[PDB]
Amino acid sequence: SGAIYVGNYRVVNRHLATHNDWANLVWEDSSRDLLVSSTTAQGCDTIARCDCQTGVYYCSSRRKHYPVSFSKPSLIFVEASEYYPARYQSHLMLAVGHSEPGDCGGILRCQHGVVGIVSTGGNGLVGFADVRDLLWLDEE
């Protein structure tokens, strides 16, 4: 579990979004595993605006943050997980690291801020849904 809190927006994995998220919906995309909802309080996170390929991510199933290199946002085939079938996911970055389903929502960050959130795992990789292209998160 986990979210990004930027401005008055809450960015979550679409598959973990709550009824309140859907009732306060700003934007969602199944192919990306992302959903954004509106918040009453302003949030503490800054979104990275960059093409970094190195950062640090939080792994809840290890209680640890790991430094990783990751691929640029890509259309990737993802094998079946507990929460999605085998399918293509877009805007997905991969690193070598540990990820189980409950790790979804952990932040990946670089020197510029939050890059994305854990969205995939298995076979010794961790996949992250990118948010750095969502420039509208920074305003309004």
Ligand X SMILES: C[C@]1(NC(=O)C2CC2)CCS(=O)(=O)C1
Please list the active-site residues.
Answer: 15, 33, 104
The reply, when asked if residue 44 is annotated as ligand binding, is no
The structure tokens listed for 68 are: 């990783």
Q: How far is the CB of 7 from ligand X (least distance, A)?
A: 23
Task: Identify what 90 binds: Zn ion, ligand X, none; CB under 5 to 8 Å per kind.
Answer: ligand X
The reply, when asked if residue 50 is annotated as ligand binding, is yes
CA angle 135, 136, 137 (to 5 degrees): 90
The structure tokens listed for 98 are: 């540990």
Report the residue number, 113 or 127, with the smaller CB distance to ligand X: 127
The reply, when asked if residue 59 is annotated as ligand binding, is no
* Residue 48 touches Zn ion, criterion: CB under 5 A: yes
Q: How far is the CB of 13 from Zn ion (least distance, A)?
A: 21
Compute CA distances 135 → 23, 95, 111, whole Å: 23, 24, 17
The Cα–Cα gap between 84 and 76 comes to: 14
The Cα–Cα gap between 116 and 121 comes to: 14
Task: Identify what 91 binds: ligand X, Zn ion, none; CB under 5 to 8 Å per kind.
Answer: ligand X
Q: If you search the block for the tokens 């990820």, which residue do you land on?
A: 99
Site for ligand X in 62-121 (CB under 6 A): 73-75, 90-91
Strand partners, 27: 36
Q: How far is the CB of 81 from Zn ion (least distance, A)?
A: 27
Q: Which residues in this chain contact Zn ion in the complex, by CB under 5 A?
A: 48, 50, 52, 110, 112
